[PDB]
Structures are given as structure tokens and as C-alpha cells.
Amino acid sequence: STVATYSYTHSVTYVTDNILKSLKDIILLSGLDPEHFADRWESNTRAIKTWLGTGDLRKVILEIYNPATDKLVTRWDIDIVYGWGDGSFWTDTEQLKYAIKKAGLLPSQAKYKLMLDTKPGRPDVEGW
Ligand SMILES: [Cl-]
Ligand code: NI
């Protein structure tokens, strides 16, 4: 049950960067290619920052998929909590590694993307 806490004791930009850094660590430790996540850093930052600030962000979801068939390999959910936390979190990456190899794939043979689960009334954000 991975939780990321946005505590208002910290700035939303710092919290956002720490969330992404914790996700980057998961991607790295799982053996996945980190390039896509780096390319998406600016857009992921904009959406997470904005929807943390409005309170609309509910979960950040890392979706691993098989690019040969485009079917889901596994999902890793990060639940968001708000209070008065720095955004950073740590988990056992074995779950991700295990799911990838269970699909008969090397991590260099899988792809991934971030999904953001929001309250339905949330404002639209450029790029999302
Ligand atoms: Cl925007
Ligand atoms: Ni602090």
C-alpha cells in the first residue's frame, strides 16, 4: 500500500519533484529504460503539481505494458494523501520486476507510462 503524502508544510513544487524522483527510482531499480520518464518530466510535473494544488489528484499509477502486444503487464498504484510528508516514498520493487519476468519479458523489452487518477471535475491541464 504505497502512499505519497503532500504535506502543506512543504511547497507543492518540491513535493511534486520528490514524487517523480521516487517513481524514477522505481523505474531504475526495476530495470526499465529511464529515458521515457525523463522525457515526460516536464509534463508529468505540470499535471501532478496542478492537481495536487487543487486537491483533485487521487492516485499516481505506473502502468507497465508489453509493446509487442500493447497489453498491460502490471499496475503500481500510489495513493495520495494530504495533510500537515514531503512526497518521497519507498517500496519493494520486487513486485514490478516479478510481474515483468512473469510475462516472459526483460525490463528492456517493456514500456511504461504514468496515469493520473483525479476527481472528475478537475481542471484540464496542457498536455493531458
Ligand atoms: Cl495548464
Ligand atoms: Ni522538509
Size of the chain, expressed as the number of residues it contains: 128
Which ligand gives the minimal distance to the CA of 7? 2
CA 114 – CA 65 distance, rounded (Å): 11
Q: Any idea which fold 2-118 has?
A: Cell Cycle, Spindle Assembly Checkpoint Protein; Chain A (3.30.900)
CA 40 – CA 38 distance, rounded (Å): 5
Q: Which residues surround ligand 1, an ion (CB under 5 A)?
A: 125-126
Q: Which method was used?
A: X-ray
What residue spans define the domains of the chain?
A: 2-118
- Which residue, 36, 92, 85, 88, is CA-closest to 64? 36
Furthest-apart CA atoms within the chain: distance in Å: 44
CA 52 – CA 32 distance, rounded (Å): 27
CA 55 – CA 68 distance, rounded (Å): 37
Helices within 1-128 (DSSP H only): 12-29, 35-39, 41-53, 94-102
Resolution of the structure in the document, Å: 1.6
Angle value at C-alpha 84, between 4 and 91, nearest 5 degrees: 20
Sign of CA dihedral 46, 35, 74, 82: negative
Which ligand gives the minimal distance to the CA of 122? 1
| 60 bridge partner residues | 78, 116
Instruction: Read off φ and ψ for residue 24, nearest 5 degrees.
Output: -55, -40
C-alpha of residue 91 to centroid of ligand 1, in Å: 31
Grid cell, residue 64, equals 507497465
Which ligand gives the minimal distance to the CA of 124? 1
Residue whose entry in the numeric block shows the C-alpha cell 492516485: 59
89 touches 3 (CB < 8 A): yes
Beta strands 2-7 and 71-83: pairing type? parallel
- Which residue, 74, 65, 63, 57, is CA-closest to 116? 57
Q: How far is CA 5 from CA 2, 27, 53, 65, 92, in A?
A: 10, 20, 13, 27, 18
DSSP state of 34: S
